[PDB]
Amino acid sequence: GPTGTGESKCPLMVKVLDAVRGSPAINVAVHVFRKAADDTWEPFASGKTSESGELHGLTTEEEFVEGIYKVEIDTKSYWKALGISPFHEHAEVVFTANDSGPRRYTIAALLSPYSYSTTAVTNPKE
Amino acid sequence: GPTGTGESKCPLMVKVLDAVRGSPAINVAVHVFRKAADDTWEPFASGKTSESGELHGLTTEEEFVEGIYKVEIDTKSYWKALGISPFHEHAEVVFTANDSGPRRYTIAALLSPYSYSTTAVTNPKE
Amino acid sequence: GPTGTGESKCPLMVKVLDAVRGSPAINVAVHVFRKAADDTWEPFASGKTSESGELHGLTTEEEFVEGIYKVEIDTKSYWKALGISPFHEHAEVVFTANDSGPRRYTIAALLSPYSYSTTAVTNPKE
Amino acid sequence: GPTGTGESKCPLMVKVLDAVRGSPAINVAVHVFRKAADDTWEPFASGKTSESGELHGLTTEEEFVEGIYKVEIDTKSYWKALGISPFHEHAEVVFTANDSGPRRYTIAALLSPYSYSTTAVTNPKE
């Protein structure tokens, strides 16, 4: 579940919440990509949210180098399973991650069938 | 149609959206209040949103004086009518109307059974 | 800080996030009221968010009986201190809390100077 | 003024709001894409939001066929222009345009340096 391509002080964590039910979004698949040298998206890490709606251990401090990363949340499969025909195919969060500043990231996403918000971070990890 | 009290160049407008169905929240009750000297809420204007999810002609420029206002939105009757169990009793937006600031105010509300956003203002008009 | 009128399995917790800075909202004063028998708001508990943007220990399982509670977040003082003139006087969350179902509550609030969202819960506590 | 490609009864419209200043996001670049057979994104329509934060006449009913669309919003250049350091590279909305569904689509985006919401649809018109 909440795991991926690494284990460290958790430089990248994802938390998904369900705005219709008032609970975390469990079993939401997440795919992380890194912008490759040839400008394409290279697959970086993936997992699914736990019963807490969280995704941990996706990567590691060493592996998480500067770059443009795309965090893709499969919202569609999530609503489908619930009996709902959602509007979005998925929710994507694209950002630059460096060395030069903030180096631990909490990407949060609040889900509604026709809407979603996404917000980012704190500082060290907690 | 769906109007409040006074009709003319709208200094205050309300718009409500349904994030579950992806459409405007139609026929929603909104009640506006002004804090009186003894700090109690005196009814100011009221109305129900139209088929477009908007409420206009609530008040007028001469009537809308500086002060503290409360826009209360009956969110619960809305979800009940749809058969979804909601969390909130209602949504509220409390703000100070200040002359040296913008004249026109659009209070936007995006609704979910367990969550809501509220955003405000602009200046010239539509 | 994150404390109030009780200590238990945390039936009521509050977390505030800053959407402009990407961090938790620290030192945000929170006031909780309970609808009184005579239909007025009786003060119930209060505190301020910690460095994590969270508020714990506000109440206790025994003290937190069925009722309509109003959670008031002093967003205005928060932005003022930051050098910003916000739009809202505060952010309020009004809901019924029972015995008959969900009995642990996490009220979260994401803050912007002219906007704010609020969402509620999970189930047991975590 | 601020238009995309084809002009007439708008099957797709975009509106962007600034949650920091409480006004429309003016002069924002939006690029629309259609997934092609080989699953690559082919440019479909583009434009900059007007003084009202809207983008109209992007396409036309005859042109807007069923398929998967991507609306990319240049959020970063927006915050840079204001001098605020943002988190996201840009905002994206990926969705399937399906005939048996509504015809008109308004993609609404509410922006903050570290957070964004996106909501959709209605049906008849304005």
UniProtKB/Swiss-Prot annotation, chains A, B, C, D:
<feature type="modified residue" description="4-carboxyglutamate; in a patient with Moyamoya disease">
    <location>
        <position position="42"/>
    </location>
</feature>
<keyword id="KW-0963">Cytoplasm</keyword>
<feature type="binding site">
    <location>
        <position position="15"/>
    </location>
    <ligand>
        <name>L-thyroxine</name>
    </ligand>
</feature>
<keyword id="KW-0765">Sulfation</keyword>
<dbReference type="GO" id="GO:0007603">
    <property type="term" value="P:phototransduction, visible light"/>
</dbReference>
<feature type="binding site">
    <location>
        <position position="117"/>
    </location>
    <ligand>
        <name>L-thyroxine</name>
    </ligand>
</feature>
<keyword id="KW-1008">Amyloidosis</keyword>
<dbReference type="InterPro" id="IPR036817">
    <property type="entry name" value="Transthyretin/HIU_hydrolase_sf"/>
</dbReference>
<comment type="function">
    <text>Thyroid hormone-binding protein. Probably transports thyroxine from the bloodstream to the brain.</text>
</comment>
<comment type="similarity">
    <text>Belongs to the transthyretin family.</text>
</comment>
<keyword id="KW-0325">Glycoprotein</keyword>
<dbReference type="GO" id="GO:0006144">
    <property type="term" value="P:purine nucleobase metabolic process"/>
</dbReference>
<dbReference type="InterPro" id="IPR000895">
    <property type="entry name" value="Transthyretin/HIU_hydrolase"/>
</dbReference>
<dbReference type="GO" id="GO:0070062">
    <property type="term" value="C:extracellular exosome"/>
</dbReference>
<keyword id="KW-0795">Thyroid hormone</keyword>
<dbReference type="GO" id="GO:0044877">
    <property type="term" value="F:protein-containing complex binding"/>
</dbReference>
<keyword id="KW-0964">Secreted</keyword>
<dbReference type="GO" id="GO:0035578">
    <property type="term" value="C:azurophil granule lumen"/>
</dbReference>
<comment type="subunit">
    <text>Homotetramer. Dimer of dimers. In the homotetramer, subunits assemble around a central channel that can accommodate two ligand molecules. Interacts with RBP4.</text>
</comment>
<keyword id="KW-0372">Hormone</keyword>
<dbReference type="GO" id="GO:0042802">
    <property type="term" value="F:identical protein binding"/>
</dbReference>
<dbReference type="InterPro" id="IPR023418">
    <property type="entry name" value="Thyroxine_BS"/>
</dbReference>
<keyword id="KW-0225">Disease variant</keyword>
<keyword id="KW-0301">Gamma-carboxyglutamic acid</keyword>
<feature type="glycosylation site" description="N-linked (GlcNAc...) asparagine">
    <location>
        <position position="98"/>
    </location>
</feature>
<dbReference type="GO" id="GO:0042562">
    <property type="term" value="F:hormone binding"/>
</dbReference>
<dbReference type="GO" id="GO:0005576">
    <property type="term" value="C:extracellular region"/>
</dbReference>
<keyword id="KW-0732">Signal</keyword>
<dbReference type="GO" id="GO:0140313">
    <property type="term" value="F:molecular sequestering activity"/>
</dbReference>
<dbReference type="Pfam" id="PF00576">
    <property type="entry name" value="Transthyretin"/>
</dbReference>
<keyword id="KW-0034">Amyloid</keyword>
<dbReference type="InterPro" id="IPR023419">
    <property type="entry name" value="Transthyretin_CS"/>
</dbReference>
<feature type="binding site">
    <location>
        <position position="54"/>
    </location>
    <ligand>
        <name>L-thyroxine</name>
    </ligand>
</feature>
<dbReference type="InterPro" id="IPR023416">
    <property type="entry name" value="Transthyretin/HIU_hydrolase_d"/>
</dbReference>
<dbReference type="GO" id="GO:0032991">
    <property type="term" value="C:protein-containing complex"/>
</dbReference>
<dbReference type="GO" id="GO:0003105">
    <property type="term" value="P:negative regulation of glomerular filtration"/>
</dbReference>
<protein>
    <recommendedName>
        <fullName>Transthyretin</fullName>
    </recommendedName>
</protein>
<dbReference type="GO" id="GO:0005179">
    <property type="term" value="F:hormone activity"/>
</dbReference>
<dbReference type="GO" id="GO:0005615">
    <property type="term" value="C:extracellular space"/>
</dbReference>
<dbReference type="GO" id="GO:0001523">
    <property type="term" value="P:retinoid metabolic process"/>
</dbReference>
<keyword id="KW-0813">Transport</keyword>
<keyword id="KW-0622">Neuropathy</keyword>
